[PDB]
Ligand binder design. Structure first.
Ligand code: CDL
Ligand code: CDL
Lengths: 57, 455
């Protein structure tokens, strides 16, 4: 009483209900470095210009 | 200082938009107006300098140099318009524009508050001067420029950038208050020479002086006036600004160079007794007078700085008048040979009177400011060592002799027979002599304005 599968059936993505838990770190990846801080705050003008030897703006 | 830079730059449309016969009169008139304006720089105080902005300030050192610089331009325009009357009109405007641009560089060289802006203006002054000497000079290597820039300007550049990275600023007003003592080492020794040797060549120093009695001879009259009147004093101004940072290493590193000057003012003065070229005689006299400015800056006492700034102003006036007298003879006999034309008091009495006054102020006849500067330098060097007075006094013998030998050779004796193109003195020439000498005589009535930041 076995029906042979049709064209397209065995290549389906099925779903499986397993009792085992999800592997929370399957790569055994250690803790990442914390990223560099972002920029915040309003942008004020440069304090007394370029400060390039004598240029006052 | 912006009230002086902008009229100086408005002299460029005032010299190019003018008519074909009006580019001497307009430029002379408005440059004399700027020179009359230049007396507002005398708003000086006994404690604080006249600090205009972040870029510009003018204490009592730069102020007489500025007044002399803005006074020198109409005098150079009066001097150089005779022999350029056969020149093309556009090249005539080019000459006047080079003089105006050189004035523009000088008046903000002396008022540069910050030291690398002083350096850029200081090495920017050399370009119009070289254009004037090479283009409107008379006669024909070039290794002097290379030897100048090796031992001079770029060691000064690296030195000022090093001070910029150590101290944090090259403002002279900040460096008055953040100056550190500079101890004995080899790094500080080459640091001291890198700071000093560019101005040493620009004075000139003896042994480094041979560029000047050729650059004066290969120059026109305006080039000689601006060399011996202002451009040799950029070295003295730069030294008086840079010896602030260079203590107390100077207290044992000024020992070689003072020797080169204290013997140098003996040698070059004696070289003035053995000259055939009048213009080279005035050149070696300029070297012998700047040697005392070198000595007075390097011994760094207050009387020495007062004498050195008085000697700078008085020598600018006196040497410019001597070059204009040499111009007046070169425009008659067409030869700079001093023994060629003689006995010229028999023909030109008023011009011989101007020669007499110029030779009296050359040998430091009191109460002239030549003698005031000379005398204060001799007082400070007597305080330095009690033997130098001999080397001073022997100098003050010889500085009389070639001042009067030049007066005896050209202006006295039997007149030359085979020279009959000696015209009477034009009114322009006597005007030039009087505008050189009458400020130099009037400063004897009130010398405290030409005695520097520490009167
Ligand atoms: C109601 C709303 C509107 C209100 C309107 C109110 C205003 C009305 C007026 C409108 C018109 C404005 C015109 C300009 C304003 C004044 C600017 C000024 O003087 O700044 C002072 C500025 C610094 O003085 P300050 O007292 O500290 O500042 C006062 C103000 O706060 C100045 O402000 P600052 O402190 O913020 O300045 C910033 C900074 C201040 O500067 C610095 O921090 C120092 C660095 C300066 C440059 C150094 C370079 C050195 C090496 C290169 C050398 C270059 C070649 C030299 C010249 C070659 C031949 C041209 O400037 C720069 O960095 C710019 C470079 C310099 C250019 C200045 C303007 C030039 C305009 C005309 C150009 C014509 C040729 C000029 C000569 C070129 C060289 C200067 O002076 C200089 O830098 C010295 C040179 C003088 C500047 C030029 C004068 C401008 C007007 C010229 C008119 C005549 C032209 C004649 C024909 C051409 C002849 C060849
Ligand atoms: C602020 C207000 C001030 C008011 C007062 C003015 C202060 C003095 C200013 C200058 C004064 C002399 C100017 C003329 C001499 C140069 C041109 C010339 O040869 O003319 C001869 C000519 C007459 O002779 P000439 O027969 O027709 O022609 C000449 C011959 O062809 C052949 O000529 P020569 O060889 O027969 O004659 C030349 C003769 C030759 O004699 C000499 O070479 C001997 C001189 C040296 C030895 C004697 C003096 C030694 C030192 C002591 C004196 C000073 C201190 C005195 C105080 C007591 C002690 C502390 O020298 C003189 O006659 C000049 C006498 C005055 C000499 C002044 C010092 C020059 C010596 C060298 C520098 C010394 C240190 C500086 C002292 C400054 C004092 C203020 O005179 C005039 O045409 C004069 C015209 C007007 C001159 C105005 C001068 C002032 C200009 C400034 C304008 C802005 C301020 C307003 C004041 C206006 C006042 C009127």
């Amino acid at each position: 009483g076995w029906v042979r599968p049709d064209l397209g059936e065995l290549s389906k993505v099925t779903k499986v209900k397993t009792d085992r838990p999800l592997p929370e770190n399957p790569y055994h990846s250690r803790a990442r470095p914390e990223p560099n801080p972002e920029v915040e705050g309003d942008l004020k003008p440069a304090r007394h210009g370029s400060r390039l030897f004598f240029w006052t703006m | 200082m912006l009230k002086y830079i902008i009229p100086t730059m408005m002299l460029m449309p005032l010299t190019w938009l003018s008519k074909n016969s009006m580019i001497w009169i307009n430029t002379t008139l408005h440059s004399l107006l700027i020179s009359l304006t230049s007396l507002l720089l005398l708003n000086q105080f006994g404690d604080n300098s006249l600090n205009f902005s972040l870029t510009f300030f003018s204490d009592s050192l730069s102020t007489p140099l500025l007044i002399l610089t803005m006074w020198l331009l109409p005098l150079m325009l009066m001097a150089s318009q005779h022999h350029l009357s056969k020149e093309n009109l556009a090249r005539k405007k080019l000459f006047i524009s080079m003089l105006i641009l050189l004035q523009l560089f000088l008046i903000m060289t002396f008022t540069a508050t910050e030291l690398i802006f002083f350096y850029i203006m200081f090495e920017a002054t050399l370009v119009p001067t070289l254009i004037i000497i090479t283009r409107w000079g008379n006669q024909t290597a070039g290794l002097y420029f290379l030897f100048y820039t090796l031992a001079g300007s770029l060691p000064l550049l690296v030195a000022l950038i090093y001070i910029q990275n150590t101290m944090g600023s090259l403002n002279f007003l900040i460096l008055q208050y953040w100056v550190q003592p500079m101890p004995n080492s080899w790094s500080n020794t080459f640091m001291w020479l890198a700071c000093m040797m560019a101005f040493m060549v620009k004075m000139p120093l003896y042994g480094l002086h041979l560029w000047l009695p050729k650059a004066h001879v290969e120059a026109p009259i305006a080039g000689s006036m601006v060399l011996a009147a202002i451009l040799l004093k950029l070295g003295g101004y730069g030294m008086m600004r840079i010896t602030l940072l260079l203590n107390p290493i100077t207290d044992f590193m000024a020992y070689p160079f003072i020797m080169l000057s204290l013997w140098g003012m003996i040698m070059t003065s004696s070289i003035c007794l053995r000259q055939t070229d009048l213009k080279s005689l005035i050149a070696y006299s300029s070297v012998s007078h700047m040697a005392l400015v070198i000595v007075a800056i390097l011994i760094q006492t207050p009387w020495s700085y007062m004498g050195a700034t008085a000697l700078m102003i008085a020598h600018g006036l006196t040497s410019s008048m001597l070059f204009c007298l040499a111009n007046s003879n070169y425009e008659r006999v067409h030869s700079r040979t001093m023994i060629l034309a003689r006995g010229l008091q028999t023909l030109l009495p008023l011009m011989a009177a101007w020669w007499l006054l110029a030779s009296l102020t050359n040998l430091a006849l009191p109460p002239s400011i030549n003698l005031i500067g000379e005398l204060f330098v001799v007082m400070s060097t007597f305080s330095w060592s009690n033997i130098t007075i001999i080397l001073m006094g022997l100098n003050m013998v010889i500085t009389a002799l070639y001042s009067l030998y030049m007066l005896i050779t050209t202006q006295r004796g039997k007149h030359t027979h085979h020279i009959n193109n000696i015209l009477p003195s034009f009114t322009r020439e006597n005007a030039l002599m009087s505008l050189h000498m009458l400020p130099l005589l009037l400063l004897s009535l009130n010398p405290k304005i030409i005695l520097g930041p520490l009167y």
